[PDB]
Amino acid sequence: DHHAWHRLLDQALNQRRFELFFQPVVAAQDTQLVLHYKVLSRLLDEQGQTIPAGRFLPWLERFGWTARLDRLMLERVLEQMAGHEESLALNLSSATLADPQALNKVFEILRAHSNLGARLTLEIGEEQLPEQAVLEQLTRRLRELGFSLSLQRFGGRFSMIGNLARLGLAYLKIDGSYIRAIDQESDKRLFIEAIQRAAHSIDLPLIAERVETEGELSVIREMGLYGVQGQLFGEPKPWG
Amino acid sequence: DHHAWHRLLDQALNQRRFELFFQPVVAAQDTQLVLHYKVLSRLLDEQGQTIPAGRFLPWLERFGWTARLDRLMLERVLEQMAGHEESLALNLSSATLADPQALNKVFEILRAHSNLGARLTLEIGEEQLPEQAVLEQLTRRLRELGFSLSLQRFGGRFSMIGNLARLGLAYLKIDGSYIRAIDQESDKRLFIEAIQRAAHSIDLPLIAERVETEGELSVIREMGLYGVQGQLFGEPKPWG
Lengths: 240, 240
Ligand SMILES: Nc1nc2c(ncn2[C@@H]2O[C@@H]3COP(=O)(O)O[C@H]4[C@@H](O)[C@H](n5cnc6c(=O)[nH]c(N)nc65)O[C@@H]4COP(=O)(O)O[C@H]3[C@H]2O)c(=O)[nH]1
Ligand SMILES: Nc1nc2c(ncn2[C@@H]2O[C@@H]3COP(=O)(O)O[C@H]4[C@@H](O)[C@H](n5cnc6c(=O)[nH]c(N)nc65)O[C@@H]4COP(=O)(O)O[C@H]3[C@H]2O)c(=O)[nH]1
What we know:
Two copies of one chain form a homodimer. Chain A is globular and about 50 Å long. In chain A, strands 1-2-4-5-6-7-8-9 form an eight-stranded mixed beta barrel, surrounded by five helices. Chain A has helices spanning 4-14, 53-63, 66-80, 94-98, 100-112, 132-144, 189-201, 214-222; strands at 18-27, 34-44, 50-52, 88-91, 120-125, 148-154, 172-174, 206-208, 227-228. Chain A has a single domain (1-240), classed as EAL domain (TIM Barrel), CATH 3.20.20. Chain A is built from eight helices and nine strands. In chain A, helix 7 links the parallel strand 7 (172-174) and strand 8. Chain A binds chain B through residues 155-156, 158-163, 165-166, 178, 187-191, 193-195, 197-198, 201-202, and chain B through 155-156, 158-159, 161-163, 178, 186-191, 193-195, 197-198, 201-202. The PDB classes it as lyase.
């Protein structure tokens, strides 16, 4: 319900009733080498359950509240990294990117935790990339404050591969759809080889998303990709 | 006015009141060597003035008349090829592939001109690709009749690069935007290079569309592309 979701999300944003979940992202050659943990937002509904980002993000956007989540989540993430030595990754939404106020606030916050710059990567989903202009300032600002930037769910937008060279990303997360059952339909290899060849040529490591299978894993590994992540390595779970 | 166009096209379509224009498609490494000529449709209006396909095609679509153009153009093109020995290229519209009747008529026509098979390439623009099934049903069909198929305005669907080898297409015409001012905007090279790497591996020659500039030509040529077309080599003109 537009107003069930509306009361719930507004209250949740205000009391900061969001939980941090994590999923390990690991080296392809060694699934015991942890590259970072990808932070996932979980919503606490009063009638019990933990609700996944996938279920609530759609409404956050419909209400234009996404930037609030972003702020909340970044403050929480930075806070919680004080407890360990692990590298983390977290999304930024197009909404934050579009509001100069929100975006400044974010830089404000990063400047306050400059110590953590080398342990937190910020991520944008392909489906909400801003202009290459915006991406360029974004990385300049971030690099100055010691933080790295990455892109994810790539790439329907593969034609921008060369634009990315000038951005010095930490890595590129490939949409899992491009590796789904790859071991089973070698059809999909040509495209992956292309990304892998191009990206390697500008020193940008590739991470394969949503790997569900040993078969999928063994081909990704073999084609020479750097990282993997997915249900093969477990459900997203609270800090451990 | 939407009204004026309805009557013009229906009338001109009925009267077969169209002119074939041509634009040469030429080797990247020798712009004097003509790979083939692309047939361009030109509407004659009431005063004998020509209207380019670019302007009138959107209306054939709205009025659902593209299959009419297709049949009329195909017949004329097959007719005029009898007067020379040059190779030609001609678009089929999605509307035809989707109309089983129109499509069989197209096959009946082709079948009636087996002898021209090796000199006529049919083209589908990327914007109007049918589903993979239709593409392959179409490829086996033309093949048995001697005719070959190609794709144009390509680049946005590079992720389908793996599905292309089983088609034995004649060539891939790369959409001009991936080429535009490539000599200034060198961001564009990595994508092109990637397309050319995959195209080499499936033995599918590339042709760059709408090349306007010696700088573009020079870059395209250096990257190994087979062919080029565009205003650099002159405007579209009647056979003469
Ligand atoms: N089919 C399949 N799915 C898998 C597999 N492995 C993990 N997943 C799921 O797909 C999403 C993966 O995380 P993500 O790539 O960061 O994708 C994320 C991320 O891009 C975004 N998101 C999550 N948290 C935040 C946040 O705090 N802020 C922003 N702006 N976006 C967020 O929404 C997505 C999260 O949705 P989730 O519901 O948490 O769902 C997660 C996860 O539950 C797999 O092997 N197969
Ligand atoms: N800016 C720029 N433009 C250039 C350049 N070189 C050529 N052009 C123009 O772009 C189009 C090129 O032909 P096309 O790629 O086959 O693209 C064609 C073709 O796909 C299609 N078309 C034309 N005739 C037919 C037809 O008889 N049947 C069907 N189904 N489609 C047709 O519509 C397009 C033709 O529209 P046109 O008005 O003829 O416009 C032509 C041409 O005038 C350049 O260097 N720069």
